[PDB]
């Protein structure tokens, strides 16, 4: 039979209708820093001003200084008509948890 599931269309909730929190979870901040540190290990191209000798410190400082070039997508629902309703959050405009 039709094993292949049909393609989905990405439905982005307008920014004034988002229901999830404006504060990053510790999981999300850790994921952002890990992903960005791996990207820097790939390229090394950053807009951070101060010099750091490791990708991890550059990633944390980019998150803390609100310069991280990543977006958080929170998948809210998969409609059985084909839509994938998600929320897009900008970590540069979000609260940052206690990463100590």
């Amino acid at each position: 039979g039709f094993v292949q599931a049909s393609s989905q269309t990405l439905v982005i909730i307008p920014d004034n209708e988002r229901i999830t929190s404006n504060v990053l979870t510790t999981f999300e901040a850790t994921r952002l820093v890990a992903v960005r540190a791996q990207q820097l290990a790939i390229n090394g191209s950053t807009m951070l001003k101060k010099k750091y000798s490791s990708p991890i410190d550059i990633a944390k400082q980019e998150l803390f200084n609100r310069k991280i070039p990543l977006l958080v997508m929170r998948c809210i629902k998969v409609t059985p008509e084909g839509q994938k309703i998600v929320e897009i959050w900008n970590p540069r405009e979000m609260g940052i948890p206690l990463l100590d």
Partner: protein, 48 residues
């Protein structure tokens, strides 16, 4: 205290003052209760 349950949603809906689900009002009941005791007028006279 009236805007306390918006901790469970976000600051966008708090600014827009959208309706709050009933189960989220109930989840802020102990913190609403505690704040009204510890921030009572008789206890906050020396606070600007």
């Amino acid at each position: 205290c009236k805007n306390l349950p918006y901790v469970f949603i976000n600051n966008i809906q708090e600014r827009l003052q959208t309706p709050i689900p009933v189960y989220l009002k109930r989840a802020a009941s102990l913190m609403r209760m505690l704040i009204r005791i510890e921030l009572a007028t008789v206890k906050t006279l020396n606070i600007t």
